[PDB]
Design a protein around this ligand. Structure first.
Ligand SMILES: Nc1nc2c(ncn2[C@@H]2O[C@H](COP(=O)(O)OP(=O)(O)NP(=O)(O)O)[C@@H](O)[C@H]2O)c(=O)[nH]1
Ligand SMILES: [Mg+2]
Length: 167
């Protein structure tokens, strides 16, 4: 079986853990438990191909680290997550994309742009804004909610398809 090393990045509080736990456990976590570094595993069938997803869930609030660069470098593909109700998180996406391109030593890294918390009424970032950004990067955009489960499977599955397209 083919294995894919996925990493979930994005600012603090955006729902990185909630998305992963939703994928793995079919459970919504309402509590905020800040992450340092957690790893998960799941077998799935995508486009009729079985695979083993290893998912690295990261800290949103983390300064410079060689250790961070180290675990990031193992990544084949990256979910770049912002919250649609959090404008700074969305502006932060640049930082993450630059960080990824640095550590991977490449301009062509499988990535998906994920706009989470779409269930909240507090939208500050428009879809068109996120679509325009993704397009500029040449990557997909998916809207998600870790609460309703909208787009969750699709975010990860799409990342895998992006990985496949790359190789
Ligand atoms: N309504 C709603 N709340 C969400 C959604 N995703 C996450 N949350 C909430 O947002 C808070 C932070 O989520 P969490 O997954 O812990 O964020 P994180 O990005 O992993 N943070 P960190 O970088 O600190 O580990 C939690 O209270 C969680 O329930 C969503 O789609 N909808
Ligand atoms: Mg987390």
């Amino acid at each position: 079986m083919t294995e894919y090393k996925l990493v979930v990045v994005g600012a603090g509080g955006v729902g990185k853990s909630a998305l992963t736990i939703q994928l793995i456990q079919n459970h919504f976590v309402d509590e905020y438990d800040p992450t340092i570094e957690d790893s998960y595993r799941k077998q799935v069938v995508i486009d009729g191909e079985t695979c083993l997803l290893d998912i690295l869930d990261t800290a949103g609030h983390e300064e410079y680290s060689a250790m961070r660069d180290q675990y990031m470098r193992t990544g084949e593909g990256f979910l770049c997550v912002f919250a649609i109700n959090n404008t700074k998180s969305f502006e932060d996406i640049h930082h993450y994309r630059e960080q990824i391109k640095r550590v991977k030593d490449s301009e062509d890294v499988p990535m998906v742009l994920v706009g989470n918390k779409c269930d909240l009424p507090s939208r500050t970032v428009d879809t068109k804004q996120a679509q325009d950004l993704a397009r500029s990067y040449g990557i997909p955009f998916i809207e998600t909610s870790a609460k309703t489960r909208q787009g969750v499977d699709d975010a990860f599955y799409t990342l895998v398809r992006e990985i496949r397209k790359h190789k």
